[PDB]
Amino acid sequence: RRTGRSALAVLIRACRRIQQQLQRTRRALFQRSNAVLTSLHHVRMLL
Amino acid sequence: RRTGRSALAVLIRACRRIQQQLQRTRRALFQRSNAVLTSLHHVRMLL
Amino acid sequence: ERAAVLQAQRTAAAAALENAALQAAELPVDIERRIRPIEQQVH
Amino acid sequence: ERAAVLQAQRTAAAAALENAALQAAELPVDIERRIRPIEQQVHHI
Amino acid sequence: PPISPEEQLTAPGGDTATAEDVSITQENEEILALVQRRSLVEWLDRGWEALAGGDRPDWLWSRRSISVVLRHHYGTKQRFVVVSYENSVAWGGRRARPPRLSSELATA
């Protein structure tokens, strides 16, 4: 029990958060990179 | 010992090589957009 | 003499949009392959 | 009179080029804020 | 489905050295693994040599590597195409003599 499983959650809670720590890097890279081309869409409205 | 620990050498190296590419995805993705930062300022440098 | 140059530089800057927009056609692209097959490894 | 037209078309898009440049320089700020907390987990676990 | 040649311009994909894209995949599909534990081109020649009846070196590079790149014209807002085959001694060919181009003045 406590000699074999008490260090599992160090590897388990690490391997259940990088699912969350890298999907928050998805949308924050797709809420912030689309605004550049949309501002580039604005230049074609002027030129 | 070669069953309990050897189920963990599977799963210590597994997390410690996911985390290492994430250092290299920071570096190989803006040195392509720094050239975009060069050209987008270069459009007004034409002007 | 200026008006031809001031147009031709403007046509260049109009072309330098889609020279750069097609160069900026990888900014929503360069991120999917560096995140998505790495999270199911964490799984 | 074409100099009055084309310089206004240049400089107004030139701010839009800078409204693109102040949006495109916001892009290398991103992952320099994203994985700097994810680079914490490296040697520990 | 038909072959649309315009999608080869408008699908955002290009060239890469891919040596950085092997180590980024070898340390990605080993996680995976640790948890766990004549060609077709020679038959294309007879595909042409029977349907045409001849060699046609015009069509010989339509079987090999073809890149079709879109660019634009700074004079009249127009578009045009930059092409390189594989066997071209021209630029972008994979049979070409050094020296080649350097994008250094365009960065300095």
In this structure, are residues E62 and C5 in contact, taking their beta carbons and an 8 Å threshold?
A: no
Residue C14: which of B4, E62, B44 has the closest Cα?
Answer: B44
The angstrom resolution of this structure is 4.5
> Cα separations (Å) of B45 from A13, A26, B10, E25, E85?
51, 33, 55, 39, 34
Kindly state whether A46 is in contact with chain B, defined as any CB-CB distance less than 8 angstroms. Answer: no
Where is E71: in which H helix or E strand? strand E66-72
Number of CB atoms found within 10 A of residue A25's CB: 22
State whether the Cα torsion B1-B6-B8-B12 is positive or negative.
positive
Kindly state whether C4 is in contact with chain A, defined as any CB-CB distance less than 8 angstroms. Answer: no
Q: What residues form DSSP beta bridges with E67?
A: E84
Residues of C in contact with E76 (CB under 8 A): 11
Where is E81: in which H helix or E strand? strand E79-85
Q: List residues of E whose CB lies inside 8 A of any C CB.
A: 12-13, 24, 28-29, 31-32, 35, 70-79
Kindly state whether D29 is in contact with chain B, defined as any CB-CB distance less than 8 angstroms. Answer: no
- Residues in chain B, overall count: 47
In this structure, are residues E91 and E84 in contact, taking their beta carbons and an 8 Å threshold?
A: yes
Contacts for B8 with CB less than 8 Å, ≥ 6 apart: A11
Elucidated via:
cryo-EM
In this structure, are residues C30 and E20 in contact, taking their beta carbons and an 8 Å threshold?
A: no
The CB-based long-range contact list for C38-41 (8 Å cut-off, 24+ gap) reads C38/A18, C38/A22, C38/B18, C38/B21, C38/B22, C38/E28, C39/A18, C39/A19, C39/A22, C39/A23, C41/B14, C41/B18, C41/E28, C41/E31, C41/E32, C41/E35
Strands (E), D1-45: none
Kindly state whether D38 is in contact with chain C, defined as any CB-CB distance less than 8 angstroms. Answer: no
Distance, in Å, from the CA atom of E15 to the CA atom of E23, rounded to the nearest integer, reads 17
- Residue D13 and residue A14: Cβ atoms within 8 Å? no
